Design an enzyme around this catalytic site. Structure first.
Site, PDB file in Angstrom:
ATOM      1  N   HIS A  67       0.806  -1.212   0.000  1.00  0.00           N
ATOM      2  CA  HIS A  67       0.000   0.000   0.000  1.00  0.00           C
ATOM      3  C   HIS A  67       0.846   1.272   0.000  1.00  0.00           C
ATOM      4  O   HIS A  67       1.888   1.347   0.664  1.00  0.00           O
ATOM      5  CB  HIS A  67      -0.964  -0.010   1.178  1.00  0.00           C
ATOM      6  CG  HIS A  67      -1.917  -1.164   1.148  1.00  0.00           C
ATOM      7  ND1 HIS A  67      -3.069  -1.197   1.903  1.00  0.00           N
ATOM      8  CD2 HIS A  67      -1.893  -2.322   0.450  1.00  0.00           C
ATOM      9  CE1 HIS A  67      -3.716  -2.324   1.667  1.00  0.00           C
ATOM     10  NE2 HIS A  67      -3.025  -3.027   0.789  1.00  0.00           N
ATOM     11  N   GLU A  69       0.612   4.213   1.376  1.00  0.00           N
ATOM     12  CA  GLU A  69       0.936   4.722   2.699  1.00  0.00           C
ATOM     13  C   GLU A  69       2.168   4.012   3.243  1.00  0.00           C
ATOM     14  O   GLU A  69       3.144   4.640   3.645  1.00  0.00           O
ATOM     15  CB  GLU A  69      -0.228   4.486   3.659  1.00  0.00           C
ATOM     16  CG  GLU A  69      -1.578   4.974   3.176  1.00  0.00           C
ATOM     17  CD  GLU A  69      -2.338   3.920   2.402  1.00  0.00           C
ATOM     18  OE1 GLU A  69      -1.846   3.498   1.336  1.00  0.00           O
ATOM     19  OE2 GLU A  69      -3.430   3.508   2.858  1.00  0.00           O
ATOM     20  N   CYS A  98      -2.521  -0.144   7.599  1.00  0.00           N
ATOM     21  CA  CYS A  98      -1.686   1.028   7.395  1.00  0.00           C
ATOM     22  C   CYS A  98      -1.908   2.044   8.515  1.00  0.00           C
ATOM     23  O   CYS A  98      -0.958   2.643   9.040  1.00  0.00           O
ATOM     24  CB  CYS A  98      -1.983   1.657   6.034  1.00  0.00           C
ATOM     25  SG  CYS A  98      -1.419   0.667   4.619  1.00  0.00           S
TER      26      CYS A  98
HETATM   27 ZN   LIG Z   1      -3.551   0.261   3.479  1.00  0.00          ZN
END
Ligand SMILES: [Zn+2]
Ligand SMILES: [Zn+2]
Ligand SMILES: [Zn+2]
Ligand SMILES: [Zn+2]
Ligand SMILES: [Zn+2]
Ligand SMILES: [Zn+2]
Ligand SMILES: [Zn+2]
Ligand SMILES: [Zn+2]
Ligand SMILES: [Zn+2]
Ligand SMILES: [Zn+2]
Ligand SMILES: [Zn+2]
Ligand SMILES: [Zn+2]
Lengths: 143, 143, 143, 143, 143, 143
Positions: A67, A69, A98
């Site tokens: 991801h 982030e 996250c």
């Molecule tokens: Zn995420």
């Protein structure tokens, strides 16, 4: 042109670099209104990508990517640059995983553009950790 | 003790600080023979833990904690301390996401003690990303 | 967008924050594809700006502001963030002093969008100091 | 032997390294009474110098050099060492341009040995930015 | 398993790496409960050791080694990692020399396991410098 | 002045800040021609000095102070500033312990002004550790 826009605009741009169509998302880590790290939806560097070789499904989605982030956070760890006391601009609100990473990292503010379902636990953690999250549209721009 | 024995010893050691009944994991990030960052099965710092208020299950897994491997990396990020070209020692071999995170972080070796069935994608990745993975037991230690 | 398009995009983007009527400049310092520092036509932080109190002309030029190129470097200095072996993207090619500053700072490439008549000494310098200078337009961008 | 002297003495020494007779000036950047960077009147490194090849005039002076003050600041940027919250010892008070750079950088005190005409705007900026400047003779010294 | 134990346990382990039987001592430098540097009783690296080539006597002891405490501090200096505002875990209380170094370095707390005779001056310096020292047994541990 | 003359000049210069009647020493740590850290015959900062309250003899030597060479290194440690591959300029050649510390710190050259009888072990060490030691006088300096 405000910093929120300058930052939220950078996220939308970086999100376009997502190397997996299943999801275009970008993230920017700011400290003192200064971009320190960024990330989009992509897999390990120097590795195949849902773009070139197709997805890497596992009963559901192309688990091939990391991801955005998280990728931003990893950039700090790999490049050795502190993320504590930073804020973040993300195209979408972080998933529960996250959200925990960002908080652990020391991110003090989440600025999202959109969000499907914010995990309740996310909200709890953010509250306990005293971290604010704010929606902020993407500014329309020039040439 | 050997260097490996000293590091894997710490992995097993730090995992004891875990705050989640269900798992005791411990990660030790090493660079040029120096422990630079560590991690164990714990949730966000300064937030309730499966230990004090009980677990946060959802689908059958106290989703409170953050994987040791990650926390070790997050620690790197949070402190600006670089994890590029490092080596990790872990009680249990990384799940697929941690594996990704770790490789993306720039670690080049994963010295584990225990291991279920390493995910296929894990090997595809470690292979492409030329990361080596080695097994090594926890040296029996005195006081 | 290409990397160049993303950077030159930011140059044009950040220049919009300029606080001096007479010029809208924007500099983006890059290292290993990461925006590390930026700048725009602005005066000292926390001091009046040609925008709020009007210009400070003297000889016909609001001498209030600091050239984007510089501010980007000053930012590097002020934050301990290194600018050695970096690459800069600027809306307009550097004046002779910024050119000097930039080369002395250790930047090895100057990717500009617009350019009047590059000073002769500028080339003598970039030549000796083996710095390359390239032109590239601001990609047309969406939202 | 006080720090002011130790520092002001270092400036006079470094100023002797000026690579352009038209002006001998040195500057030292201190933080916690610790020299962090220095500079004198010279041009880009690994470039000709008004000393070896003569001046580089442009209706007036040898524009070939970078001011000592600026050079000190650039050393921080190139070497990646923070200048925020530092003080400075300069053989001469900074010109208006450098004064803006120093302030932008975060220099909190200017210690000069001599000064022709302090630009009024310099004084204004310094005031607005709450930065003090003090004259301080060069200590006479030993072997 | 408390941090004091985790830390005091690491010291005892590292002390086993002493490269001179005349004395087995280990030291660990902690900051934010994070190990930053360590040391044991050994000589300069890439140099002979009282272990391989026998002691290096000078009317008394094998002056060949550098004290663990000092070695830890040197690791910070060599690796460029700040020791100011740290605490330390040592198998034995520091000799008067190291005590001065640690204090100078900015170590704010000494945690020893044992101690022959604490130099009175050590106690004085520690008092003047407002630094606390505490005894803390070594935790007994697992596999 | 030459670079050597500038550094050895500072060594002799900084030694004047010593706070112990019995010895005036000064060390200058250099990396890529930049003074990065220094030291002189002084005790722990913020503690009485042989100067104000008199000496702390014990066996005939005011044991209050810390050797310049060390303080220069401690300064490095305390500030996170690296001393790896540096060069030192000292008024007097290092005693055997400082020699060890310095080599262990990673300095590769010891440029002294004065020297009694370099300890044999000192040479054994500098030899093995391939460190070079050079003599150079304090240039006579003006103001
Ligand atoms: Zn995420
Ligand atoms: Zn995909
Ligand atoms: Zn649990
Ligand atoms: Zn995992
Ligand atoms: Zn203006
Ligand atoms: Zn300019
Ligand atoms: Zn000249
Ligand atoms: Zn100037
Ligand atoms: Zn021995
Ligand atoms: Zn000792
Ligand atoms: Zn004394
Ligand atoms: Zn000594």
């Amino acid at each position: 042109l405000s910093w929120q826009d300058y930052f939220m605009a950078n996220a939308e741009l970086i999100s376009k670099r997502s190397t997996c169509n299943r999801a275009y998302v970008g993230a920017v880590l700011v400290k003192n209104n200064r971009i320190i790290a960024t990330g989009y939806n992509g897999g390990v560097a120097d590795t195949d990508n849902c773009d070139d070789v197709g997805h890497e499904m596992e009963d559901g989605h192309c688990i091939r990517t990391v991801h955005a982030e998280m990728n931003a956070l990893i950039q700090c760890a790999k490049e050795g640059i502190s993320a504590n006391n930073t804020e973040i601009y993300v195209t979408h609100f972080p998933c529960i995983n996250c959200t925990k990473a960002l908080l652990q990292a020391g991110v003090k503010k989440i600025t999202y553009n959109t969000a499907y379902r914010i995990h309740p636990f996310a909200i709890e953690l953010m509250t306990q950790k005293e971290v604010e999250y704010v929606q902020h549209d993407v500014p329309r721009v020039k040439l």
